Amino acid sequence: ERPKVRDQAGRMNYYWTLLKPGDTIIFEANGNLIAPMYAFALRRGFGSGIITSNA
Amino acid sequence: GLFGAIAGFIEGGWTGMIDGWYGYHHQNEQGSGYAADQKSTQNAINGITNKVNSVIEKMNIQFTAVGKEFNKLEKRMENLNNKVDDGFLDIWTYNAELLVLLENERTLDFHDSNVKNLYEKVKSQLKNNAKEIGNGCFEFYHKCDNECMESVRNGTYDYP
């Protein structure tokens, strides 16, 4: 039991990994897996970056 | 200044000199007016163009630099990042403010030197056939035309 945040006493821990070209990922579980629907095949850029701007 | 011509032996610059940074005033019987010394003006412009190029082209353009993220148990690597950014910006502002004050004084010394190199060049041509009067001005002994006055400008007039 934990302090309610966003009106939820439960927690939700978001994990990630990069899956390499031709590599398999295996999801094995008997409870509490919040499985993917969608994933993202990356294209590496240069000159990009995150900025915080009110303009 | 350092060489003692700019605000030195010549009291002030002429607003009738606009064509070049160095030049001559006419005071002959053929009337007044100004004729610029293109050799002292152009060698000063070449030195100024190369120092203007140098100060700009040494500064190789800044690529994308963005803020980096740190959680509540990453305050050390946040303060290490901040110390790196602040310490580089201290050095960078310091090198920029060193260069601007030093090279503005060296530019004043360089231009003040170019007035010496011109004045002593005209004194060594004129010799006895004109004497110094108006601390920059030369009174011609025998007197001569605007052609003879032009001949002093272009690097001739080898009269004793």
Which residues on chain B are in Cβ contact (under 8 Å) with A49? 64-66
- Range 25-54 of A in CB contact (< 8 A) with B: 47-52
Show Cβ contacts of residue B159 under 8 Å, excluding neighbours closer than 6 positions: B125, B126, B127, B129
| Experimental determination approach used | cryo-EM
> Which of A33, A40, A34 lies closest to A17 in space, CA to CA?
A40
Q: Determine whether the interchain pair B64/A47 forms a contact, defined as Cβ–Cβ distance below 8 Å.
A: yes
Residue with the two structure tokens 């100024």: B48
Q: Which residues constitute the domain of residue B1? A: 1-160
User: Domain of B139: which CATH number?
Assistant: 3.90.20.10
Q: Pick A51's closest partner by Cβ from B63, B66, B69.
A: B66
Tokens of A41: 């095949």
**Resolution attained, angstroms:** 9.0
Residue B37, burial from CB neighbour count under 10 angstroms (0-12, 13-18, 19+):
buried
Residue B152 near residue B122, CB atoms below 8 Å: yes
Domain count along chain B? 1
